[PDB]
């Protein structure tokens, strides 16, 4: 089955200068293939650490991942206002990749451009678009992640513009249809036949250099569905 | 009998002494985040079944790129008879990602007398166990 990631502590607050610790917990030795992402307040998503403890360049030295087996954890030494956010922890050993549920951190007192918010009548299709502006499009994958409150994040699938190969998730086998256009660096998802269930946001994280990690994330695309 | 190679039945060759394998990949004609390109000799090229590429971080954690009991063969001989070990091959069409000059990029070789045809009694398929032999290992900045 899907390796089920668990983030027991769903939320927490802590003054500045605190050493916050966010803990993930796999359901079967993922052998280090685990990464952490920070979802800023501005609904965006940053790639922080990959493969348990390797820090993405740019990340402030006061971060650090840890573990091996099924108990990994992010530790933010002496917290700082610009660390606030909700941290997820997507594993990446045995696809489909699956993220945790996030541990929203508070404060006790655009290379990938996505489309526009869609609004559909229950039973119609839509075509969301990821418009990469960088240079590595047809040379780097393209994963589409689906966020909806309470459901951490679900990896949908991905296509490799450069040639056309694609991978899907079991739950989305019959729903999304990934298509891309190498001439205008753009990917498109096509949630066909919607339901009150699909009503969620849909990021399009591109995984370039690191098969099991999405580094740049779109902005999102509120696809709310009426009655 | 070279006495160096470890022969067998049919009196063939299935593996030499480490110091022998090391000596072949001893000369590298080219190394990049996409693969090696050293000059491997046919006498050896035969006993090897494949290679194992891994990225070892400064601390000490090692990640195997083609971590698989059967993705082991990323080598391939060319026109001018030069072996090109292809990193990019089993890393899902992506080349090696080195996020820090001091991360080493080890590349191991596996004599056929160690190669595993299938898993085990753990339903395991990892490159742990497979008695590998280091053959190349340059830091991140030494690669380029």
């Amino acid at each position: 089955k899907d390796i089920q990631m668990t983030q027991t502590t769903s939320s927490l607050s802590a003054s500045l200068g605190d050493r916050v610790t966010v803990s993930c917990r796999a359901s079967q030795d993922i052998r280090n293939y685990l990464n952490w992402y920070q979802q800023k307040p501005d609904g965006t998503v940053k790639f922080l650490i990959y493969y348990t403890s390797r820090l993405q360049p740019g990340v402030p030295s006061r971060f650090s991942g840890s573990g091996s087996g099924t108990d990994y954890s992010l530790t933010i030494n002496n917290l700082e206002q610009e660390d606030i956010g909700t941290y997820f922890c997507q594993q990446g050993n045995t696809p489909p990749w699956t993220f945790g549920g996030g541990t929203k951190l508070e404060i006790k007192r655009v290379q990938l451009q996505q489309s526009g918010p869609e609004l559909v009548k229950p039973g119609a299709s839509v075509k969301i678009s990821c418009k990469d502006s960088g240079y590595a499009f047809n040379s780097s994958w393209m994963n589409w992640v689906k966020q909806r409150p309470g459901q951490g994040l679900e990896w949908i699938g991905r296509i490799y513009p450069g040639d056309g190969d694609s991978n899907y998730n079991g739950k989305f086998e019959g729903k999304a249809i990934l298509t891309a256009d190498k001439s205008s660096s753009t990917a498109y998802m096509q949630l066909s036949s919607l339901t009150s269930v699909d009503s969620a946001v849909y990021f399009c994280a591109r995984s370039g250099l690191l098969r099991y990690a999405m580094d740049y994330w779109g902005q999102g695309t509120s696809v709310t569905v009426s009655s | 009998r070279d006495k160096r190679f470890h022969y067998d039945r049919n009196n063939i060759a299935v593996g030499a002494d480490e110091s022998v394998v090391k000596e072949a990949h001893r000369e590298v004609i080219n190394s990049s985040t996409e693969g090696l390109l050293l000059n491997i000799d046919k006498d050896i090229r035969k006993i090897l079944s494949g290679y194992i590429v891994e990225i070892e971080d400064t601390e000490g954690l090692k990640e195997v790129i083609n971590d698989r009991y059967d993705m082991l063969n990323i080598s391939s001989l060319r026109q001018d008879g030069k072996t090109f070990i292809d990193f990019k091959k089993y890393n899902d069409k992506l080349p090696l990602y080195i996020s820090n000059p001091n991360y080493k990029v080890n590349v191991y070789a596996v004599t056929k007398e160690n190669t595993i045809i299938n898993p085990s009694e753990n339903g395991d398929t990892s490159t742990n166990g497979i008695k590998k032999i280091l053959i190349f290992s340059k830091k991140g900045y030494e690669i380029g």
Side-chain angles (χ1 to χ4, degrees), chain A residues 1-3 5-107 111-226, chain B residues 2 5-144:
Chain A
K1 297 177 178 177
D2 280 25
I3 292 181
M5 292 301 138
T6 297
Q7 278 186 55
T8 36
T9 59
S10 40
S11 171
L12 44 60
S13 60
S15 291
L16 309 200
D18 292 317
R19 172 214 170 83
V20 182
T21 287
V22 189
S23 65
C24 198
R25 205 222 221 73
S27 84
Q28 65 178 63
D29 179 44
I30 51 186
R31 24 175 53 236
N32 293 282
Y33 289 65
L34 179 266
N35 321 316
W36 293 90
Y37 309 86
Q38 158 182 59
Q39 172 146 66
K40 274 296 191 172
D42 64 60
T44 189
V45 170
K46 269 208 169 180
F47 173 55
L48 293 171
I49 309 165
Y50 74 97
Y51 198 74
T52 309
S53 67
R54 321 277 200 55
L55 274 179
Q56 189 64 326
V59 175
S61 49
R62 60 171 196 292
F63 275 59
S64 55
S66 299
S68 184
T70 52
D71 302 33
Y72 308 75
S73 41
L74 174 56
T75 340
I76 306 173
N77 297 312
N78 49 275
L79 188 46
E80 275 186 44
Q81 172 63 67
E82 45 161 295
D83 295 312
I84 310 311
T86 314
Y87 295 71
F88 294 65
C89 56
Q90 166 246 31
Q91 62 98 310
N93 173 59
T94 286
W97 310 155
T98 27
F99 307 69
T103 306
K104 184 165 186 168
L105 171 55
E106 267 168 45
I107 287 295
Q111 203 184 75
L112 261 188
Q113 185 82 326
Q114 279 195 46
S115 97
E118 300 282 323
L119 185 43
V120 200
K121 212 154 196 172
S125 307
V126 281
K127 201 154 191 166
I128 304 174
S129 38
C130 202
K131 180 68 171 65
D132 184 301
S133 59
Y135 298 127
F137 185 66
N138 334 288
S139 46
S140 280
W141 290 85
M142 184 57 71
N143 298 294
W144 283 73
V145 181
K146 168 187 177 191
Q147 157 154 52
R148 45 209 265 62
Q151 313 292 268
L153 293 174
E154 308 172 50
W155 176 69
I156 306 175
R158 66 178 184 190
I159 187 170
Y160 187 37
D163 62 52
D165 288 68
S166 47
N167 317 313
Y168 290 61
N169 185 305
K171 177 186 179 183
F172 297 142
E173 196 88 68
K175 181 72 75 175
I177 311 179
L178 298 177
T179 149
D181 171 45
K182 306 200 289 183
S183 83
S184 65
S185 313
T186 308
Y188 303 84
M189 175 142 75
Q190 197 183 315
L191 316 181
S192 47
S193 175
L194 292 181
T195 75
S196 61
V197 183
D198 298 294
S199 297
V201 169
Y202 294 70
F203 296 80
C204 59
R206 116 184 205 304
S207 49
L209 296 286
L210 261 203
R211 15 158 306 213
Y212 60 79
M214 297 95 268
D215 23 48
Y216 222 158
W217 289 52
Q219 45 179 53
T221 307
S222 180
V223 183
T224 165
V225 182
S226 76
Chain B
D2 198 309
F5 287 120
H6 305 201
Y7 303 73
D8 53 303
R9 178 39 228 124
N10 285 312
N11 225 253
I12 325 170
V14 188
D17 306 297
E18 263 175 48
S19 309
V20 178
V21 179
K22 293 177 187 292
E23 195 44 54
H25 310 70
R26 164 76 159 169
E27 183 178 281
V28 172
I29 297 300
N30 180 295
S31 65
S32 70
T33 59
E34 298 189 80
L36 288 194
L37 175 52
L38 56 163
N39 210 302
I40 301 174
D41 168 60
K42 50 175 171 54
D43 289 70
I44 290 302
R45 196 75 178 64
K46 177 170 192 165
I47 54 177
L48 302 181
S49 60
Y51 297 75
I52 293 191
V53 169
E54 73 176 299
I55 304 176
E56 179 194 312
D57 58 52
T58 72
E59 303 97 39
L61 216 184
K62 307 168 183 174
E63 158 181 46
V64 183
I65 306 303
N66 65 298
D67 195 331
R68 198 79 194 308
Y69 97 86
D70 51 280
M71 267 142 89
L72 284 180
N73 85 306
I74 43 185
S75 53
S76 28
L77 222 36
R78 302 188 310 185
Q79 322 155 57
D80 40 62
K82 277 166 178 46
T83 292
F84 173 71
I85 302 184
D86 197 43
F87 303 149
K88 188 174 183 173
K89 178 169 175 175
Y90 283 121
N91 174 52
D92 273 332
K93 301 167 184 162
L94 297 182
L96 282 174
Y97 178 52
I98 293 171
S99 57
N100 172 316
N102 300 302
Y103 283 5
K104 302 162 67 73
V105 175
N106 300 163
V107 172
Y108 296 41
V110 181
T111 74
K112 294 147 72 69
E113 66 176 311
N114 290 159
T115 306
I116 46 177
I117 54 162
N118 36 62
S120 60
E121 305 251 290
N122 191 189
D124 194 29
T125 45
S126 54
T127 64
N128 279 307
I130 298 172
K131 185 165 183 180
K132 35 193 184 296
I133 302 177
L134 173 54
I135 56 83
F136 161 77
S137 170
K138 285 303 174 297
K139 248 105 114 67
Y141 64 78
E142 302 173 303
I143 288 191

